[PDB]
Design a protein around this ligand. Structure first.
Ligand code: CHT
Ligand code: CHT
Ligand code: CHT
Ligand code: CHT
Ligand code: CHT
Ligand code: CHT
Ligand code: CHT
Ligand code: CHT
Length: 182
């Protein structure tokens, strides 16, 4: 009898302790498919974990990693319809329900930049609205409030050439409240 990992007819198989092929199951970091062949460079849906996994070229599952537009979490599970923090890039991302990362787009009160990174404590220009927005320290857009000498209106858009904040302050066309006091 045989136990452990065995390569046969071009594929890797895993023999369990009773010398039998493991099929439709994990063995360590590796997944054995319906015919017993080790998954490699491919996506697998595990019905028991209710999640997609990506097996890399060496057979081991991807974790804390991108595969194309898709993110595998620390437990290997593909992210779906959720926020994740990638500690290696020090960046938040939003993975849509289809799995692919959001980019150049709002998600709730948050904005994902062109490479998917959530904006945070920074100004962004929304090409579709043709207006500046300010994302606060937690990512959520500022509204009905000042950021420095600029005012974000109730929909978050930067004010220009108008009276703002209870009609008390005038911002010029450049958006700046020009401070001239006695
Ligand atoms: C990564 N998924 C398998 C979930 C989609 C592939 O297009
Ligand atoms: C390590 N295994 C033998 C499981 C596969 C080699 O890629
Ligand atoms: C753009 N990301 C790096 C965030 C994923 C692409 O693989
Ligand atoms: C093997 N799983 C990927 C299912 C869990 C991580 O240990
Ligand atoms: C609000 N602006 C983007 C115009 C300037 C601040 O960076
Ligand atoms: C709440 N988000 C996850 C969207 C950003 C972290 O503050
Ligand atoms: C002085 N600012 C106008 C910038 C803030 C007023 O609250
Ligand atoms: C989320 N936006 C800033 C795009 C609109 C909120 O009113």
């Amino acid at each position: 009898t045989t136990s452990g990992w065995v390569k046969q007819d071009g594929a890797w198989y895993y023999f369990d302790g009773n010398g039998n092929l493991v099929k439709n199951a994990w063995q360590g970091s590796y997944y054995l498919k319906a015919d017993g062949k080790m998954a490699q460079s491919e996506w697998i849906y595990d019905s028991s974990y209710q999640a997609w996994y990506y097996l890399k070229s060496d057979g081991s599952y991807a974790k804390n990693a991108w595969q194309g537009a898709y993110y595998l979490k620390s437990n290997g599970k593909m992210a779906q319809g959720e926020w994740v923090y990638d500690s290696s890039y020090q960046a938040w991302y939003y993975l849509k329900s289809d799995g692919s990362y959001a980019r150049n787009a709002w998600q709730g009160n948050y904005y994902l930049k062109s490479d998917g990174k959530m904006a945070k404590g920074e100004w962004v220009y929304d090409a579709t609205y043709q207006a500046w927005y300010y994302l606060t320290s937690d990512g959520s857009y500022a509204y009905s409030t000042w950021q420095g000498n600029y005012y974000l209106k109730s929909d978050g858009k930067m004010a220009v050439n108008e009276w703002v904040d209870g009609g008390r302050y005038y911002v010029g066309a450049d958006g700046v409240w020009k401070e001239v006091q006695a």
